[PDB]
Design a binder for these strands. Sequence first.
DNA 1: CTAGTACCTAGCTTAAGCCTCAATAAAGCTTG
Lengths: 276, 51, 44, 209, 82, 97
Amino acid sequence: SAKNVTLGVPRLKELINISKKPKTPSLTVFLLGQSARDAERAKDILCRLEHTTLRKVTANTAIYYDPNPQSTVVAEDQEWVNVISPWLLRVELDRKHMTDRKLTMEQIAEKINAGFGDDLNCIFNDDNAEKLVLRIRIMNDDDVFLRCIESNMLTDMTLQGIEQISKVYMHLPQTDNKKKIIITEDGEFKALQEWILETDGVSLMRVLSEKDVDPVRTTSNDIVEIFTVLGIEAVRKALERELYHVISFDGSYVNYRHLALLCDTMTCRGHLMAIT
Amino acid sequence: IQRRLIKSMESVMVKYDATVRNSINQVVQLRYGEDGLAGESVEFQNLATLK
Amino acid sequence: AIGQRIVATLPYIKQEVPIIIVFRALGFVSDRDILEHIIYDFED
Amino acid sequence: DDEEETYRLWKIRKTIMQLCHDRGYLVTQDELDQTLEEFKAQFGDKPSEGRPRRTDLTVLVAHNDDPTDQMFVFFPEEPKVGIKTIKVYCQRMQEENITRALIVVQQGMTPSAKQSLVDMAPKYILEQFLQQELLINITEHELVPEHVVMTKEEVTELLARYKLRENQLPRIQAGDPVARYFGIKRGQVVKIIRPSETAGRYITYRLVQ
Amino acid sequence: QANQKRITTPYMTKYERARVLGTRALQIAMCAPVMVELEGETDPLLIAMKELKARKIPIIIRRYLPDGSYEDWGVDELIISD
Amino acid sequence: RDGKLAKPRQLHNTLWGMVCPAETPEGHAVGLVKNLALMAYISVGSQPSPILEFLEEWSMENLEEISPAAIADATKIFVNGCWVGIHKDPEQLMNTL
DNA sequence: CTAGTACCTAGCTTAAGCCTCAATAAAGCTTG
């Protein structure tokens, strides 16, 4: 599902000319334990990584002029039973993405309260009605301020997941090298087929610094990011792996002599000496 | 790409110290291919004691 | 902010000019008349 | 939100203690590999307005060869630490007979404090680290090979053996994560032991610049 | 360097083999005295090949080490590849 | 030429019967230099004025005559790319043309 | 008067310079 990995001559250019912005930066995140074994905990790790803004979960957004919060211009007995500005905000979410990413109105409201402080109060409907409503006021440049903060909060709020990683894939690998490999009590290799997950962005540091994520095997396919995170020697090995990947993808063979020499002369000065 | 690769490595050579140094005697590898061996005289083999 | 403004870079003009200013310069003082030339059905 | 912060601080402490063990400072195995439960019972599960707070969870260690040089680590409560919030640490630096220490900041340190850390560096060789950066031991990663810091006599032995001067070696910049992890000045070469798919093991030497 | 301290390979590399043969057959072409009794062959390159095989070429090779030093290897004294 | 954007060079679907799909130089002018199909003919141009007088006399209205009240339900007529007028009945004018 | 000829006048990428914005220490009030 994510074979836009841009192999061949473009990848050779992206490696030789060490580019800050590759066309397809991607992770190969591995999992530590029982999460690597079952799919549900793998999905739980997936949702904590996939970046999610509040646009992803809402159906539509509308603002009204309710003179009294007690009046409830919209017929909602939840606000009646729950209950200072007249200009309010109303957003409707959908159950689909809500239960796909396992959030709560309490979590969304506490995210809003942490991001914006006590400049606004969120009044959210309980997770019992068919409709998913939370109302927004402003506590005490009158309503266009609310319009602008609505736009800002929809654009970037990071309800779940981490930034710069837009979409993450999940699959069981078939190739033995990408599969986890162990040694049994009788000295076998016993190729294990555990869950892995690949991304389309790159952080390499907020990812490995996460619970149940294996910080021993997670490569990031990004030479500059590897230089920033792991250091020049890890850069040499990762660059060798990515440079051998494009050559051996065709099935052709190039002796390790030349790959080692290139990755050495490109990294013999302590910095990423792009060949330009 | 080929010309750009060549112009970055055109002076890298194996000295009589058996090490690999560029034009300014900066050491790139202590042995060529980190083994000191020619690439045209090797073969594919299988490690029997492995697995 | 507001978002999605419409500009119209014009020949022999160094910078882009918002289209409504172009219409007012063309001769339409009002706003309903200008919108009559862009959106043809006001019920949308 | 305190279980996540307690786990984060436990991993920070574990990575710092492993960093000290690799750097050469004396650490017991009990503190080297303690589970999260020992950290909970020894500090308190409540980083928000509770007893597992910074500043008296800091670590002091000493080198194996002689217990004279000592290395503190410091976790400031401030996200963006400043000069006034590091001059206190410098005053501790002076009131003790210690020489160097670490600072694991919460957010990015201010440029004025960075310039200070540059300025009193020869007197006190202290460096910084990030909260994010120390949640994983990068040396444990498969891409990072075995780095070993050479002593001066064996550096001279290496140079005399290979009949090459100090600047002809492959070099490494002091700002990259592995060299910053060990903690090493310029003009100090590092043994780097890595496996070779061609002939077994290969030893390379990177000098700090 | 002294004869005791010789760290270079005792094998005559392909480049030394090519250049020694060329520069010795050139000398034979300029009527230099041959070091090996020939059997009527007239080509200086074959004459130089015969001298190399018999290990009689009156030439030594100066191998410059990277540091700046050098070693004087006599053609008779190091192993020919072919 | 010598550009890495292959999109202009590619054989487009609208080349059917007007440009030879096979015939093109193999050098740095692939797809840029293209010959002409056999029955493909290139229009030479003529004045649109007779079409204009023919159009203005069936049931269509010029822009100056109508108001934009009735412009949404009807169809817009373009002649050489300039918006000439508006017609209520697209059918039986297409057939007439 | 005119002619002939001789002299005068498509995209990329990456550094790299240039434009603005947030801590911060001197400079001087400020009241304790």
